[PDB]
Symmetry: C3
Subunit: 30 residues, 3 copies
Amino acid sequence: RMKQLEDKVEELLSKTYHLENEVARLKKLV
Amino acid sequence: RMKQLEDKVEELLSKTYHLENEVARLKKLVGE
Amino acid sequence: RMKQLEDKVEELLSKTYHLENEVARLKKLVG
């Protein structure tokens, strides 16, 4: 369960960076 | 403490999946 | 290790609330 957890945190970290990029771009467009 | 973290990670995953859908909907409305 | 994960989850919680605020603002400006 420790590895399971660390991999989900890893995924969340890439997901939030991805969403951050998507929102920043949207703000640029309007 | 492990189950508590598992619970928080699951909730943040659910929140991120919801926000991805909201952004998708928005990009579609805005465009390129 | 458990403390590090906890730290990261705390960080992600804040990031996630920040994004929610930004998305909500965009939803209201676009409609």
